Design a protein around this ligand. Structure first.
Ligand SMILES: NC(=O)c1ccc[n+]([C@@H]2O[C@H](COP(=O)([O-])OP(=O)(O)OC[C@H]3O[C@@H](n4cnc5c(N)ncnc54)[C@H](O)[C@@H]3O)[C@@H](O)[C@H]2O)c1
Ligand SMILES: NC(=O)c1ccc[n+]([C@@H]2O[C@H](COP(=O)([O-])OP(=O)(O)OC[C@H]3O[C@@H](n4cnc5c(N)ncnc54)[C@H](O)[C@@H]3O)[C@@H](O)[C@H]2O)c1
Ligand SMILES: CCCCCCCC=O
Ligand SMILES: CCCCCCCC=O
Lengths: 485, 485
């Protein structure tokens, strides 16, 4: 049923300097459909020499593009956005195919939320003041230059858009390494910016492994900035690789986001949305609220409510419109999550529902059972470590002060959730969570809100004007207007 | 004549948690007067265990201080500023003693410019909006937490102030490692914040080597951010040491700042100020304009003008009010500069004036001759490498387009200078220099202008509101106001 077909002519090519060119190496990367475990396509595996050709194209194109007026850059970006909306069905099918997102999920969110980043960067150029005059001193905001972008597989198009749209809008030039576990939609996206009219060399695509291609980028002497969305392990290696060239380093990494239900919350109506939030994209989301923090005298009620809403999630074939969750995105991730579930069992957590093993009736495919643990201690492995699968922890508290301490009891700080009837109280608690975003009573997504981590969830912000400013340098021209006397 | 006396009771102590405490190790660091080459004092050498006590104090004090109202924090900072102004003569004598700054220079700039950073952070709290409401989403700016500050010896008090004032104002808590080659003025500064009323643990001082104390800070699991002003070599090592904890990393590093004289400039009145600018603080300044870029058909005139103004700089005893330049700050730096001068001779540059050797008549003390090279090629070592002594390069150009290419022909981008009669033209050139600051026709210093590097001159900005925001996280509270329907 899945309708995506990889272009045979460009599958094992790179997009460099306005054209698809042969890779310098013959190594291939097979792409596996997580729903069937079959290789559905191959893509090329870049070398450092390929990353060289791409950086050279980006460098050569930077003067022309940064010299293009904001209004005109905004026109190209606008057109890119139209093309995403036009080819959205094609894009939803490739995302689903490569990382198993329920086709329903791919149409409703995987693509449209990505479109939104592009829209926001377009509208943004209409008002942004690149120069400001404070007296005799003028502040000019300029593109930082050639940028390395590395993205993960869980929200593949969306994570490419959060980086490319602002980078391009700022006047930067960009070389992107997509996840080798979700390369197909990136292939469509490169074709899309080509068709949208982006000058050769402004956007460049190279496929390959993190350590080889990503490593080359992090160390390249001609790259002015690198932005990575991925694991902490990879984030730190790129930071270390980038230090001697003193690049600007932007990192969006792991999380263990808390969901505090305050005592005055409507538990029957708030536990189900939290569970659904924790298990969105089958838990494959860094900001997912996977630690639900609730009053002890209410734990047995929320346990029942969590098993109840978990048990009604339809897990199955992503090709069906009524499937809610597809499989874990790939074999490596499947086995990691499975290990985390078994670790929780072995450390004595209560298995409210779910458990290990493939989902019954989908033995082929990385289908993982939606899992809920309760009576969870903050010291447990499943409470401290990001699992990146559908595994929700229930944690009890005896005071609101205690609930905040548990929420902050983590090396991470990417996001957080608060449920409460008294809005004043809920706000004061939110301002006490050390996290880049706190969400009150399940607000809807906001494409202008800065997104990023405190502590070990990263460095920098994406989305909206904040994300746009990550790609600008800052210049002071003192004596811009001569002084008096 | 120098009147500073180190407090014998606190010289080999650390300022931790509101008191002077014994170091955990008995290692001492001798402090040498560069003007006489005599050890004038000793200070303690911290261990990782000392950095632990200091981080613990900072952590423990962070809740109280961040919970103190901006208005009240601004009052403490205001008082710190009064005390700097009151004890300025004592502070100028300690700076001069430890790193050889001409006493005249220490009174006029070394201290007052440092006072200014403190003033700017005080006034700033009066207007800064820590919360903003964009609809149903609120942006709250919060202190990032415990901060490691590492500073150099060339502008010792001033570099401590650019970091501590904004950090404290933001609500952060701070542990500072001063340069072990300029520890005496830091000792007075710690006493000063104590007397000013800063709560125990908000500011902590530990002395010691970069690799040992600085290394401990860069790697500490409880430090949320580290800011370093120093060499590229040290900047990258701290970045690498900090990567696995994902700290915020702020770096102010080397420079090779160009000074372009455009053809319409008044060469007789512009060459002398450039030379004086290059040799301020005897060249011991990262942003100093040490590459003077001038029209070829004008080189012989600027050469003569540079020798002329160089030859009239009074180099001698910093204890004399009429001394203009003191010695290089310390023996290590003296020998480094001397090697750079000899390298320039050996690579065929023209020695317009200056040369190697101690300044005649000051054989005792690290007195270095003000040196000017001309007919300098961009590929020369003396053109590519920061020298950090009084060594000015003269470079010729045949077009304004060429002059810009030479100015940007550098791994650095900390600052830059433009001389020109047509202000429109001079502005357009300034916007073409890839540098954090460009200064037109020798404007006066601006404590609100963002200061920092493009490319390899660092990451982040100091001074004014920009520097203040380096110590704030960014939080989005989505659903702050419930939505319609
Ligand atoms: N904060 C955010 O906005 C955000 C958003 C989505 C996902 N994430 C996080 O991403 C993770 C999921 O992705 P993953 O674990 O598969 O990512 P990962 O860290 O394993 O890989 C991410 C990217 O880095 C590349 N890479 C791997 N090793 C590299 C190396 N040493 N040098 C350079 N590049 C290298 C990979 O090829 C990939 O493109 C989760 O932790 C999730 O929370 C964060
Ligand atoms: N950009 C700016 O605002 C600015 C301002 C002033 C000076 N500087 C630069 O500073 C340099 C002058 O200072 P320097 O060369 O003596 O500095 P340096 O790099 O040798 O030392 C700077 C600081 O780092 C510490 N340190 C040394 N090694 C360390 C390590 N491995 N880990 C942690 N800390 C370590 C030192 O003890 C000192 O406190 C020049 O390059 C100058 O341009 C920059
Ligand atoms: C409504 C959720 C939007 C998707 C957020 C994905 C970012 C986290 O990995
Ligand atoms: C007027 C010069 C102010 C001092 C600038 C010092 C910063 C560079 O090291």
């Amino acid at each position: 049923l899945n309708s995506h077909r990889v272009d045979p002519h460009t599958a094992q090519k790179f997009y460099i300097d306005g054209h698809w060119s042969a890779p310098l190496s013959p190594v291939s990367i097979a792409v596996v459909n997580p729903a069937t475990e079959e290789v559905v396509a191959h893509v090329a595996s870049g070398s450092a020499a390929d990353v060289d050709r791409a950086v050279a194209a980006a460098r050569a194109a930077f003067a022309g593009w940064s010299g293009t007026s904001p209004e005109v850059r905004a026109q190209v970006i606008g057109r890119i956005h139209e093309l995403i909306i036009e080819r959205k069905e094609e894009l939803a099918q490739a995302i689903s195919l490569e990382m198993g997102a329920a086709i329903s999920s791919a149409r409703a969110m995987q693509v449209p939320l990505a479109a939104e980043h592009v829209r926001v960067a377009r509208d943004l150029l209409a008002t942004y003041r690149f120069q400001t005059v404070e007296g005799g001193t003028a502040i000019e905001r300029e593109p930082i230059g050639v940028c390395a972008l590395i993205t993960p597989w869980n929200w593949p198009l969306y994570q490419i858009t959060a980086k490319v749209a602002p980078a391009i809008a700022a006047g930067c030039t960009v070389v992107l390494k997509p996840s080798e576990l979700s390369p197909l939609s990136a292939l469509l996206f490169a074709q899309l910016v080509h068709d949208a009219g982006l000058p050769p060399g402004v956007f460049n695509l190279v496929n390959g492994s993190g350590p080889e291609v990503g490593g080359a980028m992090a160390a390249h002497p001609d790259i002015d900035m690198i932005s990575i969305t991925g694991s902490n392990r990879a984030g730190a290696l790129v930071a270390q690789a980038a230090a001697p060239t003193v690049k600007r380093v932007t990192q969006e990494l792991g999380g263990k986001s808390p969901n505090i239900l305050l005592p005055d919350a409507d538990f029957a109506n708030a536990v189900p949305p939290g569970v659904m939030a924790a298990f969105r994209n089958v838990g494959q989301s860094a900001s997912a609220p996977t630690r639900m923090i609730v009053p002890r005298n209410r734990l047995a009620e929320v346990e029942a409510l969590a098993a109840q809403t978990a048990g009604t999630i339809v897990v199955g074939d992503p090709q069906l419109e009524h499937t809610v969750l597809g499989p874990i995105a790939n074999e490596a991730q499947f086995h990691r999550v499975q290990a985390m579930i078994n670790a929780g069992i072995c450390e004595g957590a209560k298995l409210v529902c779910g458990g290990p093993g493939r989902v019954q009736g989908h033995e082929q495919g990385f289908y993982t059972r939606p899992t809920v643990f309760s009576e969870v201690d903050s010291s447990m492995r499943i409470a401290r470590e990001e699992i990146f699968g559908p595994v929700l922890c229930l944690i009890a508290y005896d005071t609101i002060d205690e609930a905040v301490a548990i929420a902050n009891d983590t090396v991470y700080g990417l996001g957080a959730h608060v449920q409460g009837q008294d809005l004043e109280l809920a706000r004061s608690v939110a301002s006490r969570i050390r996290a880049g975003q706190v969400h009150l009573n399940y607000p809807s997504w906001n494409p202008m809100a800065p997104f990023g981590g405190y502590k070990r969830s990263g460095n920098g912000r994406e989305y909206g004007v904040h994300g746009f400013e990550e790609y600008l340098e800052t210049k002071a021209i003192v004596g811009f207007a001569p002084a008096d006397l």
